[PDB]
């Protein structure tokens, strides 16, 4: 239904 | 076109700068999270002398710091505790700027050492029911930018209507910042920390790891050599999943 959208997901930076 | 954080402290001037395209659109600035429906360390106190020598209170070896818990006012180091960053609002010197294709974003206003606290990502904290309500509202208004940040499974931070300048950090497939979850007063918060030395004037970005529920994904202008091309990546996920289940 929503054309666009979403949630930012915290995560720790790993190289 | 860019502004400093204090330009956001005066809603009237803010508002008129916005009409001239000199500042981003208005939002309610808040100093800390607001719930839509409500729910000590072992450091040896630093001597007066060691403090004049410039030693650090609750530095790398503090026990609360290592667990990503901030110290209270009852900390052994008292006023000198350096492990109180979120509560003291001691953010990096940062500026809000208009980017070419991403809307507004964040720029370092001086060199930022590796692992420097940037800002807390503050907003209205939503449960699943409120999340879904807002998903609909934003889809229905036809919002372009999205502010939802997963905090813990039943808690999403929504910076759309209320928050601080953190809501401007753009995504990058090769970011110079990351989220960290810090415990302050029994409560969980998220903040951005540099992942490396960030030269003065550079844009501040993180990797959203975006979980997209929309039909179409927004294209990514990060400009990274490794750019994944879309915000959210390959997969589309259900709304319930994006929301933490
Ligand atoms: C938390 S906001 C950042 C603030 C936003 N730039 C603004 O002007 O309000 C996330 C939104 O910014 C935009 N955005 C952020 N990073 C982007 C990127 N790398 N490429 C394209 N659009 C981006 C998208 O519209 C996204 O929904
Ligand atoms: Zn300590
Ligand atoms: Zn302390
Ligand atoms: Zn990209």
Numbering used by the authors:
A (entry chain B): 29 to 43
B (entry chain A): 1447 to 1485, 1498 to 1703
Q: Which of the paper's sentences describe this entry?
A:
In this study, we solved the structures of an H3K36M peptide in complex with the catalytic SET domain of mammalian SETD2 and S-adenosylmethionine (SAM), or S-adenosyl-L-homocysteine (SAH), and revealed the detailed molecular mechanism by which SETD2 interacts with the histone H3 tail.
We then determined the 2.42 Å resolution crystal structure of the SET domain of SETD2 in complex with the H3K36M peptide and SAM. Clear electron density was observed for the entire H3K36M peptide and SAM based on the crystallographic analysis. Residues 32–43 of the peptide assume an extended conformation, and residues 33–35 have anti-parallel interaction with a strand (residues 1668–1670) in the post-SET motif of SETD2. The K36M residue of histone H3 is located in the active site of SETD2, confirmed by the fact that a doubly methylated lysine residue (Mly9) of the H3K9 peptide is bound at a similar position in the SET domain of its methyltransferase GLP-1. It is surrounded by a collection of aromatic side chains (Tyr1579, Tyr1605, Phe1650, Phe1664, Tyr1666, Phe1668) as well as Met1607 from SETD2. The methyl group of the cofactor SAM is pointed toward the K36M side chain of the peptide, but at a distance of 4.2 Å to its sulfur atom and 4.3 Å to its methyl group, suggesting it does not directly mediate interaction with the methionine side chain. In fact, our SETD2-H3K36M-SAM structure showed that the methyl group of SAM has a lower electron density, most likely due to the degradation of SAM during crystallization.
